[PDB]
Design a protein around this ligand. Structure first.
Ligand SMILES: *C(=O)CCCCCCCCCCCCCCC
Lengths: 161, 142
């Protein structure tokens, strides 16, 4: 009965939507919360896999898609749409990873249901000196044929010092 | 989803959704508890006395949610029960004794929500002995 995470995340979105009249405020909160979870998740991940430090953005994609996702969500997103420079790629999923159904009529058109994941991705990667942008550019819950998360390498974060 | 994910999410929820706040956390746990009970072998409790329902929560529900059974169950046989987890998972120094209540609210709802699905009305509160020992108090009015 490991549907605990899904049910719990569902209640959080429902509760944040009542606490904030504006959906943009929910997306912002979901992203910050995700970031905070992301910083913790990275430690847990490296400790359980020992994959090592990546060097290219291409290596990061294979670890995130073939190892991280499989370990935490039991799924393997596909990697496509690489930029000629290799500083951007997309994660393709059959459906929304965090949510199965949404309440109708649609009162949250601008609401990014699983925005937490994007924060998790950004927070985890920031811990490994990579400033990246994770963003849903396609979502099955939005009517799209697939769920697509675009990953963009912004810059290399300087060491703490 | 992986076990650790729930704890990560729960920790952030307590921080962000920081007594009306506890009411909110408990309220959320209540809806989740309802759905979870719904997926457990509810049928088996048909024709059973209240006592078995609470054992159900200590075993069937606690395993499903925390991958472990309750460490002990006590009762006054007058509708009140005390469930004890000697090492509660969501509790990841004496300085935190006052903060612990915040991390137990959601689970109180979880328990209350599960009881609801089984047709039982109740009030659930929690307290901490010596961290990480937690006692959940279930009160079934009658
Ligand atoms: C190379 O430098 C190794 C980097 C590995 C980064 C792993 C980041 C974890 C991705 C999290 C995805 C899990 C989904 C969890 C949903 C909340």
């Amino acid at each position: 009965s490991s549907e605990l995470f899904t049910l719990t995340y569902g209640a959080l979105v429902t509760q944040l939507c009542k606490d904030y009249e504006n959906d943009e405020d929910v997306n912002k909160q979901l992203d910050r919360m995700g970031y905070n979870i992301g910083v913790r998740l990275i430690e847990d991940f490296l400790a359980r896999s020992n994959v090592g430090r990546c060097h290219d953005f291409r290596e990061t994609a294979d670890v995130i898609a073939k190892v991280a996702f499989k370990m935490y969500l039991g799924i393997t997103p596909s990697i496509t749409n690489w930029s000629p420079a290799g500083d951007e790629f997309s994660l393709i999923l059959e459906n929304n990873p965090l949510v199965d159904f949404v309440e109708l009529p649609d009162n949250h058109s601008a609401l990014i249901y699983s925005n937490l994941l994007c924060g998790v991705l950004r927070g985890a990667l920031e811990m490994v000196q990579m400033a990246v942008e994770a963003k849903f550019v396609q979502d099955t819950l939005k009517g799209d044929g697939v769920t697509e998360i675009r990953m963009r390498f912004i810059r290399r974060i300087e060491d703490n010092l | 989803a992986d076990t650790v994910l729930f704890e990560f999410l729960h920790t952030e929820m307590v921080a962000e959704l920081w007594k009306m706040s506890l009411s909110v956390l408990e309220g959320m746990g209540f809806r989740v508890g309802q759905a979870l009970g719904e997926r457990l072998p509810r049928e088996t409790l048909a024709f059973r006395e209240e006592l078995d329902v609470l054992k159900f929560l200590c075993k069937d529900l606690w395993v499903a949610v925390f991958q472990k059974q309750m460490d002990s169950l006590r009762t006054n046989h007058q509708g009140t029960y005390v469930l004890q987890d000697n090492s509660f998972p969501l509790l990841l120094g004496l300085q935190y004794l006052e903060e612990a209540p915040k991390f137990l609210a959601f689970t109180c709802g979880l328990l209350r929500g599960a009881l609801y699905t089984l047709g039982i009305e109740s009030v659930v509160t929690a307290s901490v002995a010596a961290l990480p020992v937690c006692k959940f108090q279930v009160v079934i009015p009658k």
